Design a protein around this nucleic acid. Structure first.
Lengths: 94, 271, 46
RNA sequence: AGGACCGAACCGACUAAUGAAAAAUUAGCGGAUGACUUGUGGCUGGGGGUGAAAGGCCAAUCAAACCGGGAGAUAGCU
RNA sequence: GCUCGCCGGAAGACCAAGGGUUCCUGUCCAACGUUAAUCGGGGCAGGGUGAGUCGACCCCUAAGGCGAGGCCGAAAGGCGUAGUCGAUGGGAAACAGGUUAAUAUUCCUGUACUUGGUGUUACUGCGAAGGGGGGACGGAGAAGGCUAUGUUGGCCGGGCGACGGUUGUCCCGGUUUAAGCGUGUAGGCUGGUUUUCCAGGCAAAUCCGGAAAAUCAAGGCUGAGGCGUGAUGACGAGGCACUACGGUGCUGAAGCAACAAAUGCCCUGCUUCCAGGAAAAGCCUCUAAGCAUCAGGUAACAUCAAAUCGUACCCCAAACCGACACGGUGGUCAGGUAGAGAAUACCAAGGCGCUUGAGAGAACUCGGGUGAAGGAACUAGGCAAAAUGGUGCCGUAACUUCGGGAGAAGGCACGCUGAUAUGUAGGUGAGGUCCCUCGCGGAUGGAGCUGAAAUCAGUCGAAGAUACCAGCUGGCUGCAACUGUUUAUUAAAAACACAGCACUGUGCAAACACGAAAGUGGACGUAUACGGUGUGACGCCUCCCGGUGCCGGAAGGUUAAUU
């Protein structure tokens, strides 16, 4: 049982990319940016409540931040957690 | 028996094996085993405290019974076994009550021989009893110095002690060194000589053998530079000084016993 | 030719890392000194 | 069987000629089941360690490591 | 794109360590790249790392670390008990195919497995900080059984030749398929089952150990591979539709047999040797306190569960350690022909041509090739080159510690073809036939397959161990017995070490060593042991105690604090 408030905080965004699109189309799997602390179960819960859609399974991974250079000064982008969430057969997501 | 090995290579030429067939060809009694890791002759500070120790073969520790307290229960000798931890051979015995122990194998002992500890026990080889009960003139081994402690004198492959006298609460032992020593007469002792008496006839026959026995090589002080040893330095081979340890103390002759607490027990020093 | 530095992360950490430094008084002192100096990377710790 | 033999890997470094290289090259050379070799981790600390002993080795530094301090040592010398 | 060349026990493929975006795409060429650069590991932007079963975490411990109390220490702190950490070791579980520009045992497809809860019905002794078993272990050697893998034939598809021949004993390609589940084999280990008692296993034990007694000779454990299923599937040479020339979608034959065969597996086995070969948990089992008709245990079945972190890419290197796009770096994989071979040569798969080129064809330098006659005259020195170089057989001195010396030396044979023998000796081994406690069984049988070595006869060349590969040999002699070790980076030796020898200390709270100490090493050793010193295999051997040391003595002389 995850708290409503917690759930709302978990899910950061949808991730747009070719791969993501492919996943959505073929495998019925949505690619989300989620909180770095968000566990799989929590993510699933969030998905179910907040998008109103049955979840088969969630795979997560941590994306490491790229090191960049703004002019002369070096600086690193933040790490962030990506989640492939596979929706059950016949579940169409808006 | 001793066996001079045929010189099919140098390093085998001068080898003499001591091959006893009556030893157990097999894995030892595992309950009585325990771990025994190597020091490298280095103490808790991590410094080398005794030179020339290092390496050699992994060895288990056989838990030998030197206290020898199963009084009245007769044991029977199951087998003789190789112990890597000592010059003697050990013997796995089986008490009538079902317990097993390792003991130093004495001279005549073999599989099937019955042995017994206690005041009542028969004065025969391998039997153990207090030195007040043991007849004067007898050869004993595995001799306790303090009653109850465990055998400390005469444990090595072909050693034994003579009980020369029993004067009241003490008995006088003629130790293998030639030292005559008073010992409390209630101290325990095992009848006969300890076993593996042709141990001294073995000759390693190569450098490697020594190494296998965990003995690193020994450099001569005279081969060193003066900063290292008192004997060091000299152009060519010089040695114009009285022999001494690496720490400058005389080596040829200078006595080093300082124990004034046990001077009373020493009847006569060895010669 | 086998050069002197042959990196190993665990070894580095155990040797020089924060916790090691903390463990002893001299280590602590070193840390303090570093802090005083204004070091950004107080220890080898990543 | 063997600190046995011939010989690749592997470990070494006797001869030779020759910066890519703050010790290498190519051609040969020694050991190659052992007192062998190697990975990972551990321990020994500076008049201290370790040393099959050459004053060798202890982070390209060693008849006393490196870093900071006494310290602007002292310099009848340049 | 087509040729050419190089690596191929790597200059290929996959990891660890280390790095940390170098990966992929688009875009830009100032700088960086030893030249140019449209290219890049460079700049900028975007994308990319998907796990119950791989690894970490986790449970367990080794060396070692920390260490409540504690012992010790001016202070700081040292050592260490209980404990708790610490992998490089032990501990549950996944395979095949398909897919991305870039991930995959992680996605998808198929087919699996694991150990937890929870609930069940069925049963009914459960229970640990304790007991026992197990885990649990060395070197070498030898086979035998296997597979990986390869070769040939069969089969299936395609081919009929740019130049003489090529419808055949011809040519090219393919002929692949897992874990799991079932079977429990080659083979290895052990005698089982029941009963009774017992000073043992810190207490108890129905467990282990020990005694008896009965009865049956098969009982159990282990075990590669094969076979079956998994699989009416998947993959499949290439054909066929579309084409953003990148590829996408459909489709799909055969898919067998024999022989050879590992250094891999059975094997943590067996045999043997002495130098005598981790630990703890998981796992099995036994009970105690306990609880007692409850919990807990095992039984299947249902359901839920398996979080977290790593996953790109380089990894013998242009990405790690070397200031560089410059030598070092642990593991795994190991095709063909020749060969003893992981050597060597040429090749496969795959990967590269080393980020300045173009000419010229002087001296001189480097790295190679050949050389008349002579053959060490060179030189400090045959330094360097040259030479020797294989298998089999014959043959082989002094001296010797009887092992050696010895590959001593020195010689002969060596290709191809045919025959012996349309392929032998051997190896393997199908049908058939017989037996049978029935199976992965035993006999007999020899088809097919594979296949040396030799002899005889012929034959070609200047030359048959034809290339690469691959000892130079002998004689006298110093030193060190020997194998070893050593000055990282001018010294590898006659130096150090060595087995052996001798002296000497040391009676165990050992001498000695590291420690203001506690303590630790010596050693869980005990004089056949340990320390120190010298000598240095083996053989034959090996006067002086005045000096300096050490050992013993203590009559006298001298002699401190103290008084």
């Amino acid at each position: 049982m995850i708290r409503e408030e917690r759930l709302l905080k978990v899910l950061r965004a949808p991730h747009v990319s070719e791969k993501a699109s492919t996943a959505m189309e073929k495998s019925n799997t949505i690619v989300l940016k989620v909180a770095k602390d968000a566990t799989k179960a929590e993510i699933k819960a969030a998905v179910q409540k907040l998008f109103e859609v049955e979840v088969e399974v969630v795979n997560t991974l941590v994306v490491k931040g790229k090191v960049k250079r703004h002019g002369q000064r070096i600086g690193r982008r933040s790490d962030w957690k990506k989640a492939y969430v596979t929706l059950k057969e016949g579940q169409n997501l808006d | 028996a001793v066996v001079k090995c045929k010189p099919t290579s140098p390093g085998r030429r001068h080898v003499v094996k001591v091959v006893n067939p009556e030893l157990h060809k097999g894995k030892p009694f595992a309950p009585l085993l325990e771990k025994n890791s190597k020091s490298g002759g280095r103490n808790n500070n991590g410094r080398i405290t005794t030179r020339h120790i290092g390496g050699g073969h992994k060895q288990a520790y056989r838990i030998v019974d030197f206290k020898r307290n199963k009084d009245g229960i007769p044991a029977v000798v199951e087998r003789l076994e190789y112990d890597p931890n000592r010059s003697a051979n050990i013997a796995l015995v089986l008490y009538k009550d079902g317990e097993r122990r390792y003991i130093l194998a004495p001279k005549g002992l073999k599989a099937g021989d019955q042995i017994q500890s206690g005041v009542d026990a028969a004065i025969k080889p391998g039997n153990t009893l207090p030195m007040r009960n043991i007849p004067v003139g007898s050869t004993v081994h595995n001799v306790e110095m303090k009653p109850g402690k465990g055998g400390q004198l005469a444990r090595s492959a072909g050693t034994y002690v003579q009980i020369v006298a029993r004067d009241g609460a003490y008995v006088t032992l003629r130790l293998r060194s030639g030292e005559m020593r008073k010992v409390e007469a209630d101290c325990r002792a095992t009848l006969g000589e300890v076993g593996n008496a042709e141990h001294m006839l073995r000759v390693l026959g190569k450098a490697g053998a020594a190494r296998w026995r965990g003995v690193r090589p020994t450099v001569r002080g005279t081969a060193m530079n003066p900063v290292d040893h008192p004997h060091g330095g000299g152009e060519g081979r010089n040695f114009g000084k009285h022999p001494v340890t690496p720490w400058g103390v005389q080596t040829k002759g200078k006595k080093t016993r300082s124990n004034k607490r046990t001077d009373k027990f020493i009847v006569r020093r060895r010669s | 030719m086998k050069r002197t530095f042959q990196p190993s992360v665990l070894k580095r950490n155990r040797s020089h890392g924060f916790r090691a430094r903390m463990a002893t008084k001299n280590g602590r002192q070193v840390l303090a000194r570093r802090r005083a100096k204004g070091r950004a990377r107080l220890t080898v710790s990543k």
